[PDB]
Scaffold this active site. Structure first.
Site, PDB file in Angstrom:
ATOM      1  N   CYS A 138       0.802  -1.216   0.000  1.00  0.00           N
ATOM      2  CA  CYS A 138       0.000   0.000   0.000  1.00  0.00           C
ATOM      3  C   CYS A 138       0.846   1.281   0.000  1.00  0.00           C
ATOM      4  CB  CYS A 138      -0.987  -0.016   1.179  1.00  0.00           C
ATOM      5  SG  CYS A 138      -0.449  -0.942   2.648  1.00  0.00           S
ATOM      6  N   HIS A 187      -3.833   6.046   3.773  1.00  0.00           N
ATOM      7  CA  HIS A 187      -2.465   6.266   4.243  1.00  0.00           C
ATOM      8  C   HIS A 187      -2.009   7.652   3.826  1.00  0.00           C
ATOM      9  CE1 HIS A 187      -2.351   2.185   5.311  1.00  0.00           C
ATOM     10  NE2 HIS A 187      -1.597   1.679   4.351  1.00  0.00           N
ATOM     11  N   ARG A 214       1.223   3.649  12.659  1.00  0.00           N
ATOM     12  CA  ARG A 214      -0.223   3.443  12.560  1.00  0.00           C
ATOM     13  C   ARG A 214      -0.935   4.587  13.288  1.00  0.00           C
ATOM     14  NH1 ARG A 214      -1.616  -0.109   9.039  1.00  0.00           N
ATOM     15  NH2 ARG A 214      -0.668  -1.884  10.159  1.00  0.00           N
ATOM     16  N   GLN A 237      -0.450   5.696   8.890  1.00  0.00           N
ATOM     17  CA  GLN A 237      -1.101   4.595   8.197  1.00  0.00           C
ATOM     18  C   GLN A 237      -2.412   4.193   8.839  1.00  0.00           C
ATOM     19  OE1 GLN A 237       3.162   2.728   7.011  1.00  0.00           O
ATOM     20  NE2 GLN A 237       1.453   1.339   6.553  1.00  0.00           N
TER      21      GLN A 237
END
Ligand SMILES: NC(=O)c1ccc[n+]([C@@H]2O[C@H](COP(=O)([O-])OP(=O)(O)OC[C@H]3O[C@@H](n4cnc5c(N)ncnc54)[C@H](OP(=O)(O)O)[C@@H]3O)[C@@H](O)[C@H]2O)c1
Ligand SMILES: NC(=O)c1ccc[n+]([C@@H]2O[C@H](COP(=O)([O-])OP(=O)(O)OC[C@H]3O[C@@H](n4cnc5c(N)ncnc54)[C@H](OP(=O)(O)O)[C@@H]3O)[C@@H](O)[C@H]2O)c1
Ligand SMILES: O=C(O)c1ccc([N+](=O)[O-])cc1P(=O)(O)O
Ligand SMILES: O=C(O)c1ccc([N+](=O)[O-])cc1P(=O)(O)O
Ligand code: NA
Lengths: 369, 369
Positions: free
Chosen positions: A134, A274, A267, A161
């Site tokens: 990703c 993202h 995260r 993310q």
């Protein structure tokens, strides 16, 4: 062309199915739907009847296909792919999973960036095409205009993310955590005479409590962040951080002379977009005007946002980008370190360009050849 | 010593009051509580009686003070400070506001980093001491060991800034937004068979709806992020990003040869801790273990977190740090660009070292002389 679909039912697969319906991809193929859980009952109908669910693990069934598109995951690929190739299958394996990305017989597919490499592969016997990570796909969709011209010396990438990269259960956990935080202070939250320090105390206590829902993440995500994604590697990178460098350079065909790419993958409490904050070292002093033009004209999805507060707050965020194919990039400017240092901030949807979109586009390219 | 407290009732002030009680600072002074809207009301009682709330704009009552500690803000400082000085007041002005940080007459106070600069000032008639920006203070508490040795060539900082930095109403709004998000899907979340894409669709619709509470931020923060903090400057930086370079170099006494510091400042959905992801260019290839030693030995509050997954997730986050004076730094490692590139990730509480703590510590230093 007879095309097997594996993992069509899950989160990534469902995004892929909707996109395939939107682009009328099913008109061009004979779809064959596979299951890892139950067979013989009717396949899904996305406009036309496709018969029954077939056994995703049956080698003879898979051998009858011209291609497989799989979103089922690495465990599935590890189980089926080697046997299928060992049995003589020469069809196209199109995979979202990380399993085969760095295989010498696989191309990482991101065609707005590497169509030429994809076409060379197809014409010279490459049969395995794998969507990238990703973070990688989204960064190159934003910065392809610079990378394609060989202008990048190195890049440091600090990421923000979304939960979707970890999975649907992780997304659900994020929202549940938000609810538990709000529940803890709902009686005082809206009263301006209530102490914000008391509110803050209660939020912190709730987040640290054993009953705070943390089964998937292990620690709180809502109200916090987690500066480690995936397993440790020996050099001190996380696997998530390592993927950027090796995958980007494979996509760009620079494996013998790679652009160093590194940073910290974090995260944060977003659902499925993202974002990345990038320190880009250019080889030369390129004027910002040319940088902007080269970025903006690279592909149909990148969007260069003016460097202004209100427009940035409206355009360059997960709230704006979620569920869309748009890849905005902004805050583009030279940095204090010099006129060869470029700041950039970009946001992209993890499930679209970061997962499903390269799979369906790879199918269309193979079809057209 | 007679000390006036202004802005004691607000968020930053309330943290300062809590700390002053915890450290028994009130036992060493005669506190005089001031107000902008509640004159004549009984003053707060932190142990001992201080009478009634005085007028914060009455210059002649302020003139009887040996010192003023103010958390009331820049517009308050702008009106009262010049008038108070011109009327011949030579007391100590201790301020959290940005207004006087870059005045030639003022020292930026961060004593674990620049105690020598502070004392030289006190001994040579400096009477204005101003807390630095929250991000600058927190970064130097983390990396003081490297900066004091002249090892930093430049640094790029990508930040993950908490709601508290924007104000108490912004923290409330973050928590409100979290509740509105969960409310929209709480039934679906309780049903384990529900569709993740349906949940995701509803969350996005909710965040984009006119009814989403966004008066303070202007746009969503829960489920999102905002890569612009404070007003724009002509070179493309926000004022938040510009503050770092000018304030740190003043604190370090490096105005004649400043270290370039730049990056992107991003608001995320954390309550009151700022985190920073740093690309630190070193002048020499120093061994990692010695780097860690330099960092750890600089002050009592910095902590090196080992570069391991489980301990990082538990110890290097807002959930861990919030409401504490600890300044952890981790993910310390050399980067792909070279062994003179150091990755660092640090977390610190915005209201303590980033606002209130330098104010009470500066009071204690003055008293001690
Ligand atoms: N990009 C990412 O989100 C990401 C990140 C890391 C790892 N992965 C891996 O990649 C795989 C695909 O990701 P994903 O997020 O799409 O996984 P997912 O939503 O869990 O779907 C994976 C599979 O689970 C099965 N399944 C079982 N019960 C289900 C239900 N009630 N509803 C829908 N499907 C159900 C389906 O296969 P059958 O129809 O054959 O039963 C489905 O294809 C994951 O299983 C994981 O191993 C993905
Ligand atoms: N980078 C930035 O832009 C930045 C960052 C942080 C803070 N600041 C500024 O610094 C100042 C102090 O920050 P803060 O977060 O402590 O501001 P705050 O919580 O709004 O407190 C400031 C003042 O507001 C008054 N006030 C009005 N209604 C109140 C209520 N219901 N409860 C408590 N106080 C109330 C109080 O003064 P009276 O007792 O005199 O009424 C208080 O001293 C603010 O002006 C803020 O804008 C700026
Ligand atoms: O780890 C990954 O990058 C990844 C991404 C997507 C998918 N799935 O097939 O959509 C699976 C994986 P993984 O290799 O299963 O973990
Ligand atoms: O802008 C700032 O840096 C700032 C920081 C803290 C405080 N407050 O007094 O605690 C006020 C300001 P500002 O100069 O009012 O905006
Ligand atoms: Na828990």
């Amino acid at each position: 062309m007879r095309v097997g679909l594996v993992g069509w039912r899950g989160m990534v697969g469902s995004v892929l199915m909707q996109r395939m319906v939107e682009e009328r991809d099913f008109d061009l193929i004979e779809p064959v739907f596979f299951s890892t859980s139950q067979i013989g009952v009717p396949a899904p109908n996305f406009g036309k009847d496709a018969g029954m669910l077939h056994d995703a693990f049956d080698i003879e069934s898979l051998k009858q296909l011209d291609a497989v598109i799989t979103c089922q995951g690495g465990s599935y690929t590890e189980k089926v792919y080697p046997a299928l190739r060992q049995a003589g299958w020469k069809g196209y394996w199109i995979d979202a999973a990380s399993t085969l990305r760095m295989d010498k017989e696989a191309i990482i597919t991101l065609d707005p960036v590497n169509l030429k490499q994809i076409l060379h592969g197809i014409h010279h016997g490459t049969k395995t095409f794998v969507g990238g990570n990703c973070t990688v796909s989204l960064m190159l969709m934003a910065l392809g205009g610079l990378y394609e011209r060989g202008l990048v010396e190195w890049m440091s990438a600090m990421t923000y993310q979304a939960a979707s990269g970890a999975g649907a259960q992780n997304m659900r956990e994020l929202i549940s955590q938000m609810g538990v935080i709000n529940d803890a202070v709902s009686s005082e939250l809206a009263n301006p005479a209530s102490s914000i320090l008391d509110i803050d105390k209660k939020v912190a206590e709730t987040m640290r409590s054993g009953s705070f829902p943390t089964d998937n993440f292990g620690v709180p995500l809502a109200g916090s962040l987690i500066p480690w994604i995936d397993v440790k590697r020996d050099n001190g990178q996380s696997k998530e951080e390592w993927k950027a460098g090796v995958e980007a350079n494979k996509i760009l065909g620079l494996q013998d002379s790679p652009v160093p790419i590194d940073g910290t993958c974090v995260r944060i409490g977003a659902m499925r977009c993202h974002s990345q904050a990038l320190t880009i070292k250019l080889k030369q002093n390129i004027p910002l005007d040319e940088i902007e033009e080269m970025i903006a004209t690279h592909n149909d999805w990148v969007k260069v946002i003016p460097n202004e507060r209100d427009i940035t707050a409206r355009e360059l965020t997960p709230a704006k980008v979620t569920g869309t194919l748009s890849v905005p990039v902004g805050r583009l400017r030279k940095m204090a370190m010099g006129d060869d240092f470029l700041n950039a901030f970009t946001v992209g949807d993890q499930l679209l360009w970061g997962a499903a979109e390269p799979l369906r586009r790879t199918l269309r390219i193979i079809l057209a050849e």
